[PDB]
Amino acid sequence: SVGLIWAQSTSGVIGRDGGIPWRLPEDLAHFKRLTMGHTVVMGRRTWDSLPAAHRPLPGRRNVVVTRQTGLVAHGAQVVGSLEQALSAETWVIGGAQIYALALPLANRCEVTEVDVDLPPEDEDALAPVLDQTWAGTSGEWLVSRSGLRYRMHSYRRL
Ligand SMILES: NC(=O)c1ccc[n+]([C@@H]2O[C@H](COP(=O)([O-])OP(=O)(O)OC[C@H]3O[C@@H](n4cnc5c(N)ncnc54)[C@H](OP(=O)(O)O)[C@@H]3O)[C@@H](O)[C@H]2O)c1
Ligand SMILES: CCc1nc(N)nc(N)c1OCCCOc1cccc(C[C@@H](C(=O)O)C(F)F)c1
Ligand SMILES: [Br-]
Numbered sequence: 685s686v687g688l689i690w691a692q693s694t695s696g697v698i699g700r701d702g703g704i705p706w707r708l709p710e711d712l713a714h715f716k717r718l719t720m721g722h723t724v725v726m727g728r729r730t731w732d733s734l735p736a737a738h739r740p741l742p743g744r745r746n747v748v749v750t751r752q753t754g755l756v757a758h759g760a761q762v763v764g765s766l767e768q769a770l771s772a773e774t775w776v777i778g779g780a781q782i783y784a785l786a787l788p789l790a791n792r793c794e795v796t797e798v799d800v801d802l803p804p805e806d807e808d809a810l811a812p813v814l815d816q817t818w819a820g821t822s823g824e825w826l827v828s829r830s831g832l833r834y835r836m837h838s839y840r841r842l
């Protein structure tokens with residue numbers, strides 16, 4: 685059982701300049717709560733993007749997907765394909781390249797939509813596009829303690 689989890693702007697941006705272009709504490713809490721105790725699978729660029737005090741992600745088996753040989757990723761397992769990463773509950777935590785690999789294998793997507801305007805730029809990482817084979821249920825728009833508006837969506841494959 686494979687799930688994808690990501691946070692996107694309304695425009696579909698998930699990443700810019702090797703990072704995430706907003707801060708939303710409620711999303712980090714949501715991400716930690718859903719992934720804790722489970723394997724998390726990430727692309728090598730997303731491993732690099734984790735703040736050092738949170739890398740590897742504590743309380744979870746971290747798996748890093750790379751085409752490199754002998755990659756040093758302390759505290760993580762390093763695999764050469766998504767299939768190697770997947771051999772109870774496994775969460776694919778990004779980025780865009782690894783989402784694209786994982787989406788055909790997933791039965792579940794947990795999406796945070798963040799109501800910031802961020803027109804997609806050339807090298808932005810973008811969220812996967814979900815068609816009508818996915819059934820979504822959405823929370824209401826919520827206002828964070830910091831004033832940002834956001835909404836949680838849960839998708840299951842029909
Ligand atoms: N908002 C969110 O929810 C969210 C979540 C995660 C990440 N992000 C953001 O997204 C960005 C990173 O995403 P990204 O798409 O640039 O990178 P990414 O998917 O995290 O990682 C790309 C790397 O994965 C490896 N890879 C890709 N395809 C592979 C394959 N078929 N077999 C083996 N290895 C493969 C390669 O590693 P090597 O180059 O080492 O060979 C490649 O450079 C950052 O800005 C990050 O902050 C946002
Ligand atoms: C957290 C942003 C996010 N959001 C959803 N919804 N999906 C995702 N794929 C995702 O990206 C996962 C890759 C980036 O991850 C982190 C970035 C900064 C800090 C942490 C540590 C975090 C934890 O310990 O989990 C703690 F702050 F709670 C993780
Ligand atoms: Br962040």
Ligand SMILES: [Br-]
Nearest residue numbers: 707708709712
């Ligand atoms: Br934060």
